[PDB]
Amino acid sequence: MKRTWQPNRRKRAKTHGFRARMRTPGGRKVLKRRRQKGRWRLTPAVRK
Amino acid sequence: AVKKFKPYTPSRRFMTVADFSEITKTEPEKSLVKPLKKTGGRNNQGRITVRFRGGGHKRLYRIIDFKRWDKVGIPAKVAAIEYDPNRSARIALLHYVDGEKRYIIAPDGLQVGQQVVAGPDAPIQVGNALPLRFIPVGTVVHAVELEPKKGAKLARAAGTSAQIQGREGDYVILRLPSGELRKVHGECYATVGAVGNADHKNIVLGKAGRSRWLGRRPHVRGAAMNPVDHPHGGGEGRAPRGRPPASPWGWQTKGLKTRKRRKPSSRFIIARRKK
RNA sequence: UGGUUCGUGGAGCCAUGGGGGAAUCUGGGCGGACCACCGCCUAAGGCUAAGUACUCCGGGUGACCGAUAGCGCACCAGUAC
RNA sequence: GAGCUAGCCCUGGCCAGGGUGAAGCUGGGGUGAGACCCAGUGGAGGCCCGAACCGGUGGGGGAUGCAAACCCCUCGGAUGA
RNA sequence: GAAUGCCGGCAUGAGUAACGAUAAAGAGGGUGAGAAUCCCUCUCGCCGUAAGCCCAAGGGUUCCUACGCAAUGGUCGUCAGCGUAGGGUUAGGCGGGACCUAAGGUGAAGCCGAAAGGCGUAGCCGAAGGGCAGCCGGUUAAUAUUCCGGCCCUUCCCGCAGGUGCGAUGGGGGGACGCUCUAGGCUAGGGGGACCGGAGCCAUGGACGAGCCCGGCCAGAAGCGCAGGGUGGGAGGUAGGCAAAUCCGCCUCCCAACAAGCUCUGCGUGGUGGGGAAGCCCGGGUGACAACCCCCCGAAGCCAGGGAGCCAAGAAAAGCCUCUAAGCACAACCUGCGGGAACCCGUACCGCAAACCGACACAGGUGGGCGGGUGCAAGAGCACUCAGGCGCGCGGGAGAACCCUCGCCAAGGAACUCUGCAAGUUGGCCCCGUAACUUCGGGAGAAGGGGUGCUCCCUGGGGUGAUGAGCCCCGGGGAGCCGCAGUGAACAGGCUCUGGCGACUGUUUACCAAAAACACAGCUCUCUGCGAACUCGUAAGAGGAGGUAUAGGGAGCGACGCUUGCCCGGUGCCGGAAGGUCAAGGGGAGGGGUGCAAGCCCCGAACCGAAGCCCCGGUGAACGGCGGCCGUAACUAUAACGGUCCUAAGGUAGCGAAAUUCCUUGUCGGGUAAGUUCCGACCUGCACGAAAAGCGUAACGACCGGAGCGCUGUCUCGGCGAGGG
RNA sequence: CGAUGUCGGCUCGUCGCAUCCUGGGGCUGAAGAAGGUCCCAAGGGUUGGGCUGUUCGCCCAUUAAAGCGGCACGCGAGCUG
RNA sequence: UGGGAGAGGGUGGUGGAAUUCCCGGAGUAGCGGUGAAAUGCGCAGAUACCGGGAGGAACGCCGAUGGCGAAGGCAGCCAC
RNA sequence: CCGAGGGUAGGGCCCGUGACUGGGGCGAAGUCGUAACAAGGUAGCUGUACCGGAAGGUGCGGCUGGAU
RNA sequence: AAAUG
RNA sequence: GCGGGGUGGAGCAGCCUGGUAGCUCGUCGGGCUCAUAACCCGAAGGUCGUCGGUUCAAAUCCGGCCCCCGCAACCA
Ligand SMILES: [Mg+2]
Ligand SMILES: [Mg+2]
Ligand SMILES: [Mg+2]
Ligand SMILES: [Mg+2]
Ligand SMILES: [Mg+2]
Ligand SMILES: [Mg+2]
Ligand SMILES: [Mg+2]
Ligand SMILES: [Mg+2]
Ligand SMILES: [Mg+2]
Ligand SMILES: [Mg+2]
Ligand SMILES: [Mg+2]
Ligand SMILES: [Mg+2]
Ligand SMILES: [Mg+2]
Ligand SMILES: [Mg+2]
Ligand SMILES: [Mg+2]
Ligand SMILES: [Mg+2]
Ligand SMILES: [Mg+2]
Ligand SMILES: [Mg+2]
Ligand SMILES: [Mg+2]
Ligand SMILES: [Mg+2]
Ligand SMILES: [Mg+2]
Ligand SMILES: [Mg+2]
Ligand SMILES: [Mg+2]
Ligand SMILES: [Mg+2]
Ligand SMILES: [Mg+2]
Ligand SMILES: [Mg+2]
Ligand SMILES: [Mg+2]
Ligand SMILES: [Mg+2]
Ligand SMILES: [Mg+2]
Ligand SMILES: [Mg+2]
Ligand SMILES: [Mg+2]
Ligand SMILES: [Mg+2]
Ligand SMILES: [Mg+2]
Ligand SMILES: [Mg+2]
Ligand SMILES: [Mg+2]
Ligand SMILES: [Mg+2]
Ligand SMILES: [Mg+2]
Ligand SMILES: [Mg+2]
Ligand SMILES: [Mg+2]
Ligand SMILES: [Mg+2]
Ligand SMILES: [Mg+2]
Ligand SMILES: [Mg+2]
Ligand SMILES: [Mg+2]
Ligand SMILES: [Mg+2]
Ligand SMILES: [Mg+2]
Ligand SMILES: [Mg+2]
Ligand SMILES: [Mg+2]
Ligand SMILES: [Mg+2]
Ligand SMILES: [Mg+2]
Ligand SMILES: [Mg+2]
Ligand SMILES: [Mg+2]
Ligand SMILES: [Mg+2]
Ligand SMILES: [Mg+2]
Ligand SMILES: [Mg+2]
Ligand SMILES: [Mg+2]
Ligand SMILES: [Mg+2]
Ligand SMILES: [Mg+2]
Ligand SMILES: [Mg+2]
Ligand SMILES: [Mg+2]
Ligand SMILES: [Mg+2]
Ligand SMILES: [Mg+2]
Ligand SMILES: [Mg+2]
Ligand SMILES: [Mg+2]
Ligand SMILES: [Mg+2]
Ligand SMILES: [Mg+2]
Ligand SMILES: [Mg+2]
Ligand SMILES: [Mg+2]
Ligand SMILES: [Mg+2]
Ligand SMILES: [Mg+2]
Ligand SMILES: [Mg+2]
Ligand SMILES: [Mg+2]
Ligand SMILES: [Mg+2]
Ligand SMILES: [Mg+2]
Ligand SMILES: [Mg+2]
Ligand SMILES: [Mg+2]
Ligand SMILES: [Mg+2]
Ligand SMILES: [Mg+2]
Ligand SMILES: [Mg+2]
Ligand SMILES: [Mg+2]
Ligand SMILES: [Mg+2]
Ligand SMILES: [Mg+2]
Ligand SMILES: [Mg+2]
Ligand SMILES: [Mg+2]
Ligand SMILES: [Mg+2]
Ligand SMILES: [Mg+2]
Ligand SMILES: [Mg+2]
Ligand SMILES: [Mg+2]
Ligand SMILES: [Mg+2]
Ligand SMILES: [Mg+2]
Ligand SMILES: [Mg+2]
Ligand SMILES: [Mg+2]
Ligand SMILES: [Mg+2]
Ligand SMILES: [Mg+2]
Ligand SMILES: [Mg+2]
Ligand SMILES: [Mg+2]
Ligand SMILES: [Mg+2]
Ligand SMILES: [Mg+2]
Ligand SMILES: [Mg+2]
Ligand SMILES: [Mg+2]
Ligand SMILES: [Mg+2]
Ligand SMILES: [Mg+2]
Ligand SMILES: [Mg+2]
Ligand SMILES: [Mg+2]
Ligand SMILES: [Mg+2]
Ligand SMILES: [Mg+2]
Ligand SMILES: [Mg+2]
Ligand SMILES: [Mg+2]
Ligand SMILES: [Mg+2]
Ligand SMILES: [Mg+2]
Ligand SMILES: [Mg+2]
Ligand SMILES: [Mg+2]
Ligand SMILES: [Mg+2]
Ligand SMILES: [Mg+2]
Ligand SMILES: [Mg+2]
Ligand SMILES: [Mg+2]
Ligand SMILES: [Mg+2]
Ligand SMILES: [Mg+2]
Ligand SMILES: [Mg+2]
Ligand SMILES: [Mg+2]
Ligand SMILES: [Mg+2]
Ligand SMILES: [Mg+2]
Ligand SMILES: [Mg+2]
Ligand SMILES: [Mg+2]
Ligand SMILES: [Mg+2]
Ligand SMILES: [Mg+2]
Ligand SMILES: [Mg+2]
Ligand SMILES: [Mg+2]
Ligand SMILES: [Mg+2]
Ligand SMILES: [Mg+2]
Ligand SMILES: [Mg+2]
Ligand SMILES: [Mg+2]
Ligand SMILES: [Mg+2]
Ligand SMILES: [Mg+2]
Ligand SMILES: [Mg+2]
Ligand SMILES: [Mg+2]
Ligand SMILES: [Mg+2]
Ligand SMILES: [Mg+2]
Ligand SMILES: [Mg+2]
Ligand SMILES: [Mg+2]
Ligand SMILES: [Mg+2]
Ligand SMILES: [Mg+2]
Ligand SMILES: [Mg+2]
Ligand SMILES: [Mg+2]
Ligand SMILES: [Mg+2]
Ligand SMILES: [Mg+2]
Ligand SMILES: [Mg+2]
Ligand SMILES: [Mg+2]
Ligand SMILES: [Mg+2]
Ligand SMILES: [Mg+2]
Ligand SMILES: [Mg+2]
Ligand SMILES: [Mg+2]
Ligand SMILES: [Mg+2]
Ligand SMILES: [Mg+2]
Ligand SMILES: [Mg+2]
Ligand SMILES: [Mg+2]
Ligand SMILES: [Mg+2]
Ligand SMILES: [Mg+2]
Ligand SMILES: [Mg+2]
Ligand SMILES: [Mg+2]
Ligand SMILES: [Mg+2]
Ligand SMILES: [Mg+2]
Ligand SMILES: [Mg+2]
Ligand SMILES: [Mg+2]
Ligand SMILES: [Mg+2]
Ligand SMILES: [Mg+2]
Ligand SMILES: [Mg+2]
Ligand SMILES: [Mg+2]
Ligand SMILES: [Mg+2]
Ligand SMILES: [Mg+2]
Ligand SMILES: [Mg+2]
Ligand SMILES: [Mg+2]
Ligand SMILES: [Mg+2]
Ligand SMILES: [Mg+2]
Ligand SMILES: [Mg+2]
Ligand SMILES: [Mg+2]
Ligand SMILES: [Mg+2]
Ligand SMILES: [Mg+2]
Ligand SMILES: [Mg+2]
Ligand SMILES: [Mg+2]
Ligand SMILES: [Mg+2]
Ligand SMILES: [Mg+2]
Ligand SMILES: [Mg+2]
Ligand SMILES: [Mg+2]
Ligand SMILES: [Mg+2]
Ligand SMILES: [Mg+2]
Ligand SMILES: [Mg+2]
Ligand SMILES: [Mg+2]
Ligand SMILES: [Mg+2]
Ligand SMILES: [Mg+2]
Ligand SMILES: [Mg+2]
Ligand SMILES: [Mg+2]
Ligand SMILES: [Mg+2]
């Protein structure tokens, strides 16, 4: 049966991407929250 | 002049289609078309503002000249009559002696190859457009500018027409297709005659398919829903309304006058619509 | 309408969205409706250190913990997953 | 968070084969002229039988399963919403 | 010591369930300490519109080589998608970018919002759309249209010659399009051949044969040829294409019009360049100087922007062509030749799966192309099979019960059971033949019969060719042969009668309901005159709609047929410059506080004062409602009539123990040996009823009842046999 | 109530006696045959079908007779639903 | 051949009287209706009277015991 | 080969029959109305249409077989 | 106005 | 189980708020008619379901019983 995860590299980058985060005050806060916690990757990775 | 079909399929029993008799050209004029962006009933926000629309066959919009006072006193030969999927009216292609080409709505009885012209001194002849004050009272007319130099807004649907009942001051009095009587300014241009394709209302669709082809998505009753969705919803088994029939939003749908009262156009309306 | 202890209360005072709209000291505001007396202070321009607040950072010290405790992590942790 | 699901918009792709035989057109008959009748050509349709493809009617098995919805037989639509 | 406590650890169940499809295995020979599991060979089975091959998405070194087996692999393991190390991805022409735009996103201008921010024309981004120049062959353990060989091609820069008013982000043309059917001519591909090439083979009773088996092509510049696409030529006038303009458009004249010509492709040929088997011998070598031809079938693909028909009326920008403007004409553009230049990223491998999405090497899910041969009417169906790929990563024994899945049965044939649930029967093509009823299409494949294999003779027609032969495609008649059975295996409807419901194909509770529910054309009401009504948003702004009452929103009913009665008292809506009511405000009679006072401050009647409400009316396809008790006919029984209280007004037509009937298995009739269900009637309708529509209706239904035939392991009633456990 | 699965049917039984048959009797308004009522007696037996979800019941065709009841209205870690 | 009559028929166009409804002026205690009343209407300003507008239907006198058509039927006026 | 006939299947016409139902026919003195023959007390009738316990009433149009 | 025998 | 009702012969007022029973038809008597109905003028008839209680006094207010309709009987 078709499951919930059908990966698409263009989508993952346009939706959760870094340039997407910067464009909204929410997403900007998303980055600030992750840096303070000290995560190693602020954005999901994708090879493009 | 509608055509029928033998009932060789159950949906084809009652279907009817237009004869397409007056149509002289199978394809439009390239220079006069542009893309009609299908809205799907959704606005710039993305929300649906009008339910149950979209999914219709793809169409190319055909530019219409709702301002014939543009080219005053320059005649034109009726080149052809084409089919427009963007309105109920047939349209007619015009080749001006000026060389420019334009579409106008095709009035009834307009035959290809005749002269049409617009101007205060233009003859009273089907197809010619004049300001209202220069049109004999009583004559049929259509494609009426509501206000001067703002584009024809009235009497554009298939077979519609507007009549002239008299003049008062700068304004003239019309009987709109709805029956309403309204003072319209004389300087508003208007095309004489009645809109063509009068048999449009006798088209029997035939099946749910043709509802979709035109872009009409299925419309579901209110009583077939649930409380959160519609006022009529819910109820064990089938059920009557149980309240004054109300729109999905609460305001009643049985004879509730919606027009704003203090609208300044009230001064210029003489008689509310008839029937 | 808001602030003040003040929830329309006798409800001033400070601030103010709408309306009407003065004076230049013999001008003006306040002393809890309002009046008089007697007093206080000069609105509608602006700046001003020190005394106060916090602890990512450095140090000192614990009748603070001692690897299920103590920061989630004494160890390659905001990692594996 | 619409990479599942629901709707819409932009742009591409797919639907073996077979059967039925609408209108129209040509001829002939007919009539004052017509309607109309018959044979032929014609190839319409949310038409029929039926793969792919999209479904999930009935039964059985599976029930710590191959599987947090599957497998077998059977069954519906299959040029159209 | 307990909180189905938290964390961790070790037991129990238990050597029990299970080892992930029942497509299947055996033997021999290698290596190794060790082998059913690794490798080589022979034999056997499995898919073959794939379980084969090529892409795209996703995955990220899993590809190749060497060396290894603690763990990973549902057992083992020398093996591997695992561990270690080395190696491996080559492009002007394939794809993407330095070109274009679509939804959409962003957004100079501009608008909006407490802040954050939200809109918005031009512009810009945005592709699996448009546009764009490479085909075949070889080679590596691994890459190749990328390296190599042969034959082609594009753009840019410079130089040169020839030609011309050159020049663009501005004008115009073109790009440029739907669904169904479809002509002609080719190619892909396929079949045959006594013709050409070939190593061989004679078996086991026959065959030295016109015998068997293998193979008989691919690409190709200019030119040529066949087949199609596209486009008329000149002159004059011009006010339109937001400047100009010879271009375009419009008008007039002249010549040409299925043409011809000019132009672009597609196929064939083409200098020339490669490929090239079975078999035998150890991936290579031979075969071989390999041959490379003829006939038939033939595309959904190519010519292509073909043609016809129809209604729902079928993208934009750029490249390309032309037109002119500043400018500039020592230039610049174009055509041709020569010499130079040509950058970034991707190329391995998996890719219907053990490497992707499902926690797993998971019986599930994943878009596009090719997908061969024979036969069965056909076909991507079924069966067998080529190339190619696998036997699904535990086996070996035994031959109990029991479950799963499958096969058979005496006599009976629904007695089973809630129900024929299930399993049988029927089954494809041909010809005869086919009822009520109907909306004239239908019902209808109704039903129900007969034929079907092979051989000999005779004979019609079509395609190809040429008109014949050859090959191919359709048939027709006569005489005969065999078997239990001739669509001899596999794929392939049981049928009929009568009700309720819904018109119909369709849609839904992904994941227990596919229905009688939703939707649907169609009917009716009602709203809206444009900056519409309505909707989203505080707004701006959008949608409505680049629509205009034959249009648009809202509500109910749901084809069509015949119809839809009475009540407007209450509620809702519509109408109603009177009156009554009514807050702010106006108004200020009249009072009060205080000051010596001028004055300051507060209370405050009548009267003037919108919508709304009361009040008068209208309105049912608006919300809703539509009586009781009593008497009476020359038998009885029942009341067509009458009496009386009440209502706003008292249920009309049609139907009715119904999807509704409590009493109920109402009563009568049918069908049955027997019928609480079903069917037809009756009517005292506990409690149908006319757009929450009423009564019907041909056709349709994996909907829900009742009946019959056919056939059956459903059953009396069980028995045997097969395979996986 | 940190679960005692609830009607009916199939399957499989087992018990009680207030016995329906069969056996042994008393009385009889018992002539015989055949019955009526009561006593003893539970060893064995107690059919098939129609309708309804039915238990019960009604009906058809038989029968020696077509008995009533208990075992969680026996029995769902056995099934049906 | 030449003439005559006629509501014979079909299409298009057109005239006034009257009825109802709306707007304006003026005006007030009833109008309307029957055998006689009542329902209705009317101070929220009706009837009656003046001016203006919209819309449909039928064609007074002429006209008749008349004319035309096969029949049903055909009547303002102009034209084809 | 034909063939009496027998079996199977589906049609056609006719006769009888059937819960129930529709009107109709007649049948000395049932009930309720009074529509027609007088201008029947609303002139009659007719075709058609809707409505009514019943005859009948009304609408449109036609006839005189209508009197004064 | 106004029925029936 | 809950609600309403019973009164001349029939169908209803009066009951709430005690003192007085009324409306229509019918029945009876007499009128008009040839006669009947219709119509006109008169007239009679009800101790309020029953029983008990309160009160000076009960159709009337309160209790018990009979009958008459009407509503409810739900989760299992
Ligand atoms: Mg997951
Ligand atoms: Mg997807
Ligand atoms: Mg992608
Ligand atoms: Mg780091
Ligand atoms: Mg958005
Ligand atoms: Mg919602
Ligand atoms: Mg609501
Ligand atoms: Mg409701
Ligand atoms: Mg409901
Ligand atoms: Mg209901
Ligand atoms: Mg509103
Ligand atoms: Mg406050
Ligand atoms: Mg308070
Ligand atoms: Mg207080
Ligand atoms: Mg305050
Ligand atoms: Mg100051
Ligand atoms: Mg200051
Ligand atoms: Mg601190
Ligand atoms: Mg510190
Ligand atoms: Mg310590
Ligand atoms: Mg220590
Ligand atoms: Mg710790
Ligand atoms: Mg320790
Ligand atoms: Mg530890
Ligand atoms: Mg978002
Ligand atoms: Mg989506
Ligand atoms: Mg395919
Ligand atoms: Mg086909
Ligand atoms: Mg097909
Ligand atoms: Mg075909
Ligand atoms: Mg065909
Ligand atoms: Mg056929
Ligand atoms: Mg044709
Ligand atoms: Mg013809
Ligand atoms: Mg035909
Ligand atoms: Mg044909
Ligand atoms: Mg089928
Ligand atoms: Mg089908
Ligand atoms: Mg799918
Ligand atoms: Mg679905
Ligand atoms: Mg299933
Ligand atoms: Mg199941
Ligand atoms: Mg499950
Ligand atoms: Mg199927
Ligand atoms: Mg079908
Ligand atoms: Mg479509
Ligand atoms: Mg304890
Ligand atoms: Mg537990
Ligand atoms: Mg426990
Ligand atoms: Mg063991
Ligand atoms: Mg055990
Ligand atoms: Mg075991
Ligand atoms: Mg085992
Ligand atoms: Mg199997
Ligand atoms: Mg071995
Ligand atoms: Mg193995
Ligand atoms: Mg990739
Ligand atoms: Mg090795
Ligand atoms: Mg292992
Ligand atoms: Mg490795
Ligand atoms: Mg190259
Ligand atoms: Mg560059
Ligand atoms: Mg761009
Ligand atoms: Mg700005
Ligand atoms: Mg911004
Ligand atoms: Mg934006
Ligand atoms: Mg492309
Ligand atoms: Mg390219
Ligand atoms: Mg490779
Ligand atoms: Mg190659
Ligand atoms: Mg090369
Ligand atoms: Mg020049
Ligand atoms: Mg030029
Ligand atoms: Mg252009
Ligand atoms: Mg062809
Ligand atoms: Mg072939
Ligand atoms: Mg060959
Ligand atoms: Mg050969
Ligand atoms: Mg040879
Ligand atoms: Mg031999
Ligand atoms: Mg062979
Ligand atoms: Mg060639
Ligand atoms: Mg040509
Ligand atoms: Mg020309
Ligand atoms: Mg010129
Ligand atoms: Mg010009
Ligand atoms: Mg110009
Ligand atoms: Mg020119
Ligand atoms: Mg030219
Ligand atoms: Mg070529
Ligand atoms: Mg050699
Ligand atoms: Mg040789
Ligand atoms: Mg050919
Ligand atoms: Mg194709
Ligand atoms: Mg093409
Ligand atoms: Mg074409
Ligand atoms: Mg555009
Ligand atoms: Mg551009
Ligand atoms: Mg110049
Ligand atoms: Mg590759
Ligand atoms: Mg698959
Ligand atoms: Mg594939
Ligand atoms: Mg694999
Ligand atoms: Mg495996
Ligand atoms: Mg798998
Ligand atoms: Mg996996
Ligand atoms: Mg093929
Ligand atoms: Mg094939
Ligand atoms: Mg074949
Ligand atoms: Mg054969
Ligand atoms: Mg197959
Ligand atoms: Mg093989
Ligand atoms: Mg594979
Ligand atoms: Mg494997
Ligand atoms: Mg056998
Ligand atoms: Mg048997
Ligand atoms: Mg047998
Ligand atoms: Mg039988
Ligand atoms: Mg039974
Ligand atoms: Mg049944
Ligand atoms: Mg069932
Ligand atoms: Mg079955
Ligand atoms: Mg029949
Ligand atoms: Mg027929
Ligand atoms: Mg048949
Ligand atoms: Mg044979
Ligand atoms: Mg019926
Ligand atoms: Mg029924
Ligand atoms: Mg349906
Ligand atoms: Mg479901
Ligand atoms: Mg509709
Ligand atoms: Mg209408
Ligand atoms: Mg708003
Ligand atoms: Mg707006
Ligand atoms: Mg707009
Ligand atoms: Mg509408
Ligand atoms: Mg409905
Ligand atoms: Mg209905
Ligand atoms: Mg109604
Ligand atoms: Mg009402
Ligand atoms: Mg009302
Ligand atoms: Mg109102
Ligand atoms: Mg006031
Ligand atoms: Mg004083
Ligand atoms: Mg008011
Ligand atoms: Mg009501
Ligand atoms: Mg009697
Ligand atoms: Mg009735
Ligand atoms: Mg009723
Ligand atoms: Mg009726
Ligand atoms: Mg129903
Ligand atoms: Mg019976
Ligand atoms: Mg019977
Ligand atoms: Mg039966
Ligand atoms: Mg039932
Ligand atoms: Mg009864
Ligand atoms: Mg009903
Ligand atoms: Mg009802
Ligand atoms: Mg109704
Ligand atoms: Mg019905
Ligand atoms: Mg119906
Ligand atoms: Mg019918
Ligand atoms: Mg029906
Ligand atoms: Mg269906
Ligand atoms: Mg059935
Ligand atoms: Mg069995
Ligand atoms: Mg067995
Ligand atoms: Mg076995
Ligand atoms: Mg427990
Ligand atoms: Mg329970
Ligand atoms: Mg005993
Ligand atoms: Mg005993
Ligand atoms: Mg006894
Ligand atoms: Mg005995
Ligand atoms: Mg005895
Ligand atoms: Mg019973
Ligand atoms: Mg029995
Ligand atoms: Mg027992
Ligand atoms: Mg019990
Ligand atoms: Mg059930
Ligand atoms: Mg079930
Ligand atoms: Mg003459
Ligand atoms: Mg007036
Ligand atoms: Mg009055
Ligand atoms: Mg009055
Ligand atoms: Mg005559
Ligand atoms: Mg015979
Ligand atoms: Mg015979
Ligand atoms: Mg009447
Ligand atoms: Mg009488
Ligand atoms: Mg009492
Ligand atoms: Mg008493």
Numbering used by the authors:
A (entry chain 17): 1 to 48
B (entry chain 1D): 2 to 276
Task: Quote the study's own text.
During protein synthesis, ribosomes discriminate chirality of amino acids and prevent incorporation of D-amino acids into nascent proteins by slowing down the rate of peptide bond formation. To provide structural insights into the poor reactivity of the D-aminoacyl-tRNAs in the peptide bond formation we determined the crystal structure of T. thermophilus 70S ribosomes in complex with hydrolysis-resistant analogs of aminoacyl-tRNAs. We used cytidyl-cytidyl-puromycin (CC-Pmn) as an L-aminoacyl-tRNA analog that carried L-methyl-tyrosine residue (L-mTyr) and adenyl-cytidyl-cytidyl-adenylyl-D-phenylalanine (ACCA-D-Phe) as a D-aminoacyl-tRNA analog that carried D-phenylalanine residue (D-Phe). Using either of these compounds as an A-site substrate, we determined their crystal structures in complex with the T. thermophilus 70S ribosomes carrying messenger RNA and tRNAifMet in the P site.
Here, we need to note that the ribosome structure in complex with A-site CC-Pmn has been reported previously at ∼1Å-higher resolution. The only reason why we determined it again is to validate the accuracy of our structural models determined at 3.7Å resolution. For this purpose, we compared our 3.7 Å-resolution structure of the 70S/CC-Pmn-complex with similar or identical structures that were determined previously at 2.4–2.8 Å resolution. Our comparison revealed no significant differences in the location and orientation of the CC-Pmn molecule on the 70S ribosome between the new and the previous structures. In all analyzed structures, the L-mTyr was tightly fit into the A-site pocket due to shape complementarity between the ribosomal A-site and the amino acid backbone. This similarity of L-mTyr conformation in different crystal structures illustrated that, despite limited detail, our 3.7Å-resolution maps allowed reliable model building, which was due to (i) the strong signal from bulky aromatic side chains of amino acids, (ii) chemical restraints used during real-space fitting and model refinement and (iii) limited volume of the A site pocket that leaves A-site substrates little freedom to move. Our electron density maps revealed that, in both crystal structures, the CCA-ends of aminoacyl-tRNA analogs establish canonical contacts with the A-loop, illustrating that the presence of D amino acid residue does not impede recognition of the CCA-end by the ribosome. The electron density maps revealed the backbones of both L- and D- amino acids, as well as the entire side chain of the L-methyl-tyrosine. In case of L-amino acids, the α-amino group (such as the one in CC-Pmn) forms a hydrogen bond (H-bond) with the 2′-hydroxyl of the nucleotide A76 of the P-site tRNA (black dotted line), which plays critical role in (i) its positioning for the optimal nucleophilic attack onto the carbonyl carbon of the P-site substrate and (ii) the subsequent shuttling of the protons (solid arrowhead).
